[PDB]
Amino acid sequence: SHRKYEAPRHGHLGFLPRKRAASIRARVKAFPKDDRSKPVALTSFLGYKAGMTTIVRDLDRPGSKFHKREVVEAVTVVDTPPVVVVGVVGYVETPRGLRSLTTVWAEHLSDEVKRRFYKNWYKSKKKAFTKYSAKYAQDGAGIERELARIKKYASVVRVLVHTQIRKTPLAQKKAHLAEIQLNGGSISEKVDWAREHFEKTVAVDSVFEQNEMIDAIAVTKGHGFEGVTHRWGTKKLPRKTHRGLRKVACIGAWHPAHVMWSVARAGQRGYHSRTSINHKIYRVGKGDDEANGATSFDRTKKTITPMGGFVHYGEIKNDFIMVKGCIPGNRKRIVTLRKSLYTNTSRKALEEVSLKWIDTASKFGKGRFQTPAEKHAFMGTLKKDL
Amino acid sequence: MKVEIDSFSGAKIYPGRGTLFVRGDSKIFRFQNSKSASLFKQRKNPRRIAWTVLFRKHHKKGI
Amino acid sequence: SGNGAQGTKFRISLGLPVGAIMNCADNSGARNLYIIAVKGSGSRLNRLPAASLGDMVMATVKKGKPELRKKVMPAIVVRQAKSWRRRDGVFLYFEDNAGVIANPKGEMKGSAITGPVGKECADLWPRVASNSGVVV
RNA sequence: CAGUCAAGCGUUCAUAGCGACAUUGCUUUUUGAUUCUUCGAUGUCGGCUCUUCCUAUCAUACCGAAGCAGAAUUCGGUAAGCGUUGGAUUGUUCACCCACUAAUAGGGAACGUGAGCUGGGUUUAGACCGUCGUGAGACAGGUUAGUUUUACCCUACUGAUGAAUGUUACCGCAAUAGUAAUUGAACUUAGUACGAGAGGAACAGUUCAUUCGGAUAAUUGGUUUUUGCGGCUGUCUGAUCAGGCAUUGCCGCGAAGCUACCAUCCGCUGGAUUAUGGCUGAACGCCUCUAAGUCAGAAUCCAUGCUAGAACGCGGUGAUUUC
RNA sequence: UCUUAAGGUAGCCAAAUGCCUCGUCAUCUAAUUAGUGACGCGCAUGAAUGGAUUAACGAGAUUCCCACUGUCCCUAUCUAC
RNA sequence: UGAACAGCCUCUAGUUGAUAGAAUAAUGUAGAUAAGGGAAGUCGGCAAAAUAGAUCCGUAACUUCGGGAUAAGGAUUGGC
Ligand SMILES: [K+]
Ligand SMILES: [Mg+2]
Ligand SMILES: [Mg+2]
Ligand SMILES: [Mg+2]
Ligand SMILES: [Mg+2]
Ligand SMILES: [Mg+2]
Ligand SMILES: [Mg+2]
Ligand SMILES: [Mg+2]
Ligand SMILES: [Mg+2]
Ligand SMILES: [Mg+2]
Ligand SMILES: [Mg+2]
Ligand SMILES: [Mg+2]
Ligand SMILES: [Mg+2]
Ligand SMILES: [Mg+2]
Ligand SMILES: [Mg+2]
Ligand SMILES: [Mg+2]
Ligand SMILES: [Mg+2]
Ligand SMILES: [Mg+2]
Ligand SMILES: [Mg+2]
Ligand SMILES: [Mg+2]
Ligand SMILES: [Mg+2]
Ligand SMILES: [Mg+2]
Ligand SMILES: [Mg+2]
Ligand SMILES: [Mg+2]
Ligand SMILES: [Mg+2]
Ligand SMILES: [Mg+2]
Ligand SMILES: [Mg+2]
Ligand SMILES: [Mg+2]
Ligand SMILES: [Mg+2]
Ligand SMILES: [Mg+2]
Ligand SMILES: [Mg+2]
Ligand SMILES: [Mg+2]
Ligand SMILES: [Mg+2]
Ligand SMILES: [Mg+2]
């Protein structure tokens, strides 16, 4: 018989299977559509989620009650030291799909990226790319041949970049290597832009600008095996239920004589790849810039780092991106920031954002001071004498 | 962007921090955290709580 | 929110489900209002309709004038007591839950309001705003 | 539940909407009929929970018709994409009413679903009543009390490893499979169109909200073996200091972590179509959206986008054992 | 008038007994097939097969109210095994 | 301690036995806490919570005059 009361389904059948992602670095599965007219540029960037803080800003939204009034907003800080371009890939179009034709690497690779090619770096003799580095023996004629092949063929060109993980407060030491598509200019122009940027660094302000809407691609926080009450959000069974109430009561009808693929069942929660879109960049901060956290309305001499540092992460010494709201992934997690796939004219986008104040109180408790000077000015002299 | 003052402890309140409580006689109390809110709800005297601004003012500490 | 409501209300945390008895803040003669419905509420299995500040609800009077009792009438919630967050970041709440008897258009049956009134309720309901004394 | 005819109703008028007398069907969600399967047992009502399917569509999209001025309605097409509720009384299916709502449509899945629950009902043995019976006792009559067992196997499903491919490492492709957003209000349009008046829209724009989904923890709240700090009782260590025990002794606060429409953020744009309205245009020297050809066009479809990645689909690239 | 041995008195009641039936009226509620109070041609109430009442008592059945709460809205978190 | 052969701690006496180690997923069994609401849950407040000792106030209907009664409903409580 019928259900007797309609209720929408629990969960989303388009986020299946709820399995662990194949890698800790979620892959960019679609790049912005190329425009040959614009100058050659990167389509995404790599970074590490540091943590969240709070801002206050004036809201510019005519017709809303809070027009020209101050709003408190949560933001997420991503530590984005400049990436290093080390390689270029050529992709040819085939009836079976886009196929890699060849890769060309830079003459010199750093240790933090060479570590990526080893499982046991300390035991190794570190022979990686030693014979490849000999292709630049006389004039790099092999490199020129491969670049010529990429120019002749290869409708799509991507550059291999690696993070500068040594500039982050992380214990990892092993940089993350990723392919980032080049948008703009002809194929030869893209190949050149890779060739004169081998072993050079690319700053985040050359890829992203203020107020821009971007996408965050990251693997979410892991939670291990979860039951259906929290993995799928089903109703808890009554208190009187024999043999357990954190379950689905009926996992199927007698016919079909099987458990459906669409019935909620316990298993792995979290550690899923997620592409979240339409996050507004509130600040592109610079590492070589004291007073990152100072604004026009503030001029309070302070960086972006909270008192005691970002909890479980550390301190921001490099360039950073401030995105409104939250993004998938936890602190210290590698996150890829991608340019918007379409043009957004919703007037929630394309609205210039001017920060008035950035919160730098301690997140390790109920922080009540923004700077040590403020704390000392409030509390006076303590027994601990500096 | 006004820095408010805790009605129990005298702590400075930055935007989004703590709570605001409207009493039945429409008197407004601001609290920087649930500690000040809880002691106020417990009807503790701020003048008898050693770490508050009223206490240090009354006992002339750090002046 | 609803008929006679001036503009739209940004979402307020719901603190008053169906069955809540809230104080009656006007001088109509009623002592409390029993919430039986919320105007503009959605549909979900097992989910109670719940009211917040500035909502029009349908209520009965359990204590008060006998000519007011045993009837269904509209009311507007004027004090919440469940903590809610304004857009400017402040979480706030009152001691009690309070409402005023209204007609469906949004005029108060009584002529005065006892105690404070939420700002969202005053901005939505001009008759409440004009009858009210201190707003928050 | 649907059709054919059309007496009559509908001021005038069979067919806008109805539709008698008749009559043709369809369905299997009622109740019967039958007795083919099961009596070395297929757990026998409902509710709760959860998934999916059907369409004979209540709402939402786009439309055609009206006795369609407007508003509100009614009939109908494509259409099941997406929703279809909170309660009082009843074990109830059903019913009825209160109320919100865009709407509170109808059904199936062994009258879906009891090694999922519950045990209200029904359905052993106790007991009472009424009627019946000489009586023992009977009563889809009422009432009260009455043990709800077993998964560790196989498959299915949810997640998790993994031999083999010269090895090992990194970067990738994308077959296939899945897929998602939904609905309302307020402002403006506008007291405008329309209407004698009474009344009274719509498109474009703007701000919010509902239902759902994905995440996230700066803030607020909750949680506390941080047994972290303090307090308190009883007892014990001669007192003090500092501690034990009271199965986490109790109370206040309590970071971190986890977490809540109890918190915050985010949820794409292209093509081809349906219905329908057309262009050109014969058949049929006229006409005709159709026959050849062709243009718009839906909550539809397929992509874009999103999830997984074939562990017997593939590519690029690094190093490949000097006793 | 017919017929009985005599035709149900006092009481009591849709009652744990009333089929029709969710009886009708009132009250209780926003709404009540539940409860209570009335009514009574009572399928089929009724006088030691005891009738009617009844303070006190009851791990008996039932309805409402106050208090109270994770029963629920709507879940979350912690400890031991 | 306390009204107490209650509960809790200690002395004499006795035992230190019950397969162990590691780790802290889901679902359990036992123990708990919860913002706002407060029975909307359910056949049904089932389960849980709330109350609670002592002192002093104050206690209705009804009654077989004995009760009802700790009715109901309040105030206080440490140490020195
Ligand atoms: K807290
Ligand atoms: Mg059981
Ligand atoms: Mg924190
Ligand atoms: Mg329900
Ligand atoms: Mg047979
Ligand atoms: Mg058999
Ligand atoms: Mg037999
Ligand atoms: Mg079976
Ligand atoms: Mg149809
Ligand atoms: Mg119910
Ligand atoms: Mg069945
Ligand atoms: Mg069973
Ligand atoms: Mg079964
Ligand atoms: Mg039973
Ligand atoms: Mg029996
Ligand atoms: Mg596909
Ligand atoms: Mg969630
Ligand atoms: Mg001992
Ligand atoms: Mg013991
Ligand atoms: Mg023509
Ligand atoms: Mg593979
Ligand atoms: Mg008589
Ligand atoms: Mg009732
Ligand atoms: Mg009665
Ligand atoms: Mg009778
Ligand atoms: Mg007894
Ligand atoms: Mg003594
Ligand atoms: Mg002991
Ligand atoms: Mg033991
Ligand atoms: Mg609570
Ligand atoms: Mg109920
Ligand atoms: Mg019931
Ligand atoms: Mg109990
Ligand atoms: Mg009594």
Mind telling me the CATH class of chain C? Mainly Beta
Count of β-strands of chain C: 9
* Strand arrangement in the largest pleated sheet of chain B: 1-2
Q: Radius of gyration of chain B, Cα only, in angstroms?
A: 12 Å
Global geometry of chain C: globular
Topology-level CATH name of chain C: Ribosomal Protein L14
Rg for CA atoms of chain C? 14 Å
Give the CA-based shape of chain B: globular
- Largest interface between protein chains, with number of residues from each side: B-C, 12 and 16 residues
Sheet with the most strands, sense and barrel status of chain B: 2 strands, antiparallel
**Assembly annotation:** part of a larger assembly
PDB class: ribosome
Keywords: RNA modification, ribosome maturation, translation regulation, ribosome
Entry title: Hypomethylated yeast 80S bound with cycloheximide, P-site tRNA, A-site tRNA, messenger RNA and eIF5A, PRE
Chain A: 60S ribosomal protein L3
Label this structure with key terms.
part of a larger assembly, 3 chains, A: 386 residues, mainly beta, Elongation Factor Tu (Ef-tu), domain 3, Ribosomal Protein L3, Chain: B, domain 2, 2 domains, 6-stranded antiparallel sheet, 6-stranded antiparallel barrel, 5 helices, 10% helix, globular, B: 63 residues, alpha+beta, two-stranded antiparallel ribbon, 2 helices, binds potassium ion, binds magnesium ion, RNA-binding, phosphoprotein (chain A), methylation (chain A)
